[PDB]
Amino acid sequence: KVTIGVASNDTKAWEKVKELAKKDDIDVEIKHFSDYNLPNKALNDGDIDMNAFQHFAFLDQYKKAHKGTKISALSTTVLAPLGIYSDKIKDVKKVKDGAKVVIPNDVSNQARALKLLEAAGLIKLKKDFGLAGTVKDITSNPKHLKITAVDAQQTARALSDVDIAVINNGVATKAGKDPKNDPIFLEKSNSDAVKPYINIVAVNDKDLDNKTYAKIVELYHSKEAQKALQEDVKDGEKPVNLSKDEIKAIETSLA
């Protein structure tokens, strides 16, 4: 009676939720999607009841691009740090001049990726670079990096043809990579700066008070499902369980 859309393979927690939900006469069905552009339309069209694959910034930008979509965060799931990867150089400080760089092309992850390149000391962005910054906002490119933006799901595959790639945690693990230990540089994830990237369970605004959905997110956050999640992702992601007001605060802040 409840279909959850996901876009990554880290689903042990949801599998446990499905297992536990039976006891409450709730039949959970996990539906996987091939990229980030399908789950929100599926949710908006009623194909699924909720999805869990995106962060606050991505949803915010999606809503800005689709004024007819009334979807909001019901619960938070995890913080999944972004990382810089390379099959050629393992010291981010020794990236060769002229290196080819690949980053996600959607508004929020592209800006996020550029900020990470900046944090690694590879480029400089305008002082007021926002959550929607772009390549045009780079102020200095000392290493003459050749930056190319591709769909988020293709940054990992590109590794063989480029020097470095900024890959989303779920895409990296989808490629069988360790999002904690494989990156040559990890995104800072212990301050307010990373709040826009906390992942969420999203639902149609009309269902924000649904008691069955409430139960589902409750189970997700229960000790049992959380133990499953930790054994599944290890230290690759950090569980987050914000209160309703904290969730809205971020949503309001981004809009």
Dihedral of the alpha carbons of 35, 39, 42, 46, in degrees to the nearest 10: 160
Closest CA to 170 of 148, 182, 153, 158: 153
CB-side exposure of 42: number of CA atoms within 13 Å?
22
Tokens of 176: 């069988």
CB-side exposure of 226: number of CA atoms within 13 Å?
13
CA distances from 77 to 27, 32, 54, 169 (A): 20, 17, 10, 14
Question: What approach was used to elucidate this structure?
Answer: X-ray
Where is the chain broken, named by the residue before each break, C–N > 2.5 Å?
Answer: none
Cβ–Cβ < 8 Å for 80, 179 = yes
Q: At how many Å resolution was this determined?
A: 1.7
Tokens of 8: 């990554």
Side chain identity at 193, as an amino acid letter?
Answer: A
Under the phi-then-psi rule, with left for phi > 0, alpha for psi from -120 to 50, and beta for the rest, what region is 46? Answer: left
HEC states along the chain?
A: CEEEEECCCCCHHHHHHHHHHHHHCCCEEEEECCCCCCHHHHHHCCCCCEEEEEEHHHHHHHHHHCCCCCEEEEEEEEECCCEEECCCCCCHHHCCCCCEEEEECCHHHHHHHHHHHHHCCCCEECCCCCCCCCHHHEEECCCCCEEEEECHHHCCHHHHCCCEEEECHHHHHHCCCCCCCCCCEECCCCCHHHHHHEEEEEEEHHHCCCHHHHHHHHHHHCHHHHHHHHHHHCCCCEECCCCHHHHHHHHHHHC
Q: Domains in the chain, please, with CATH?
A: 1-79+191-255 (3.40.190.10), 80-190 (3.40.190.10)
- Sheet containing 164-167, strands listed edge to edge, beginning at the edge strand earlier in sequence: 146-150, 100-104, 164-167, 83-85, 185-186
Cβ–Cβ < 8 Å for 16, 48 = no
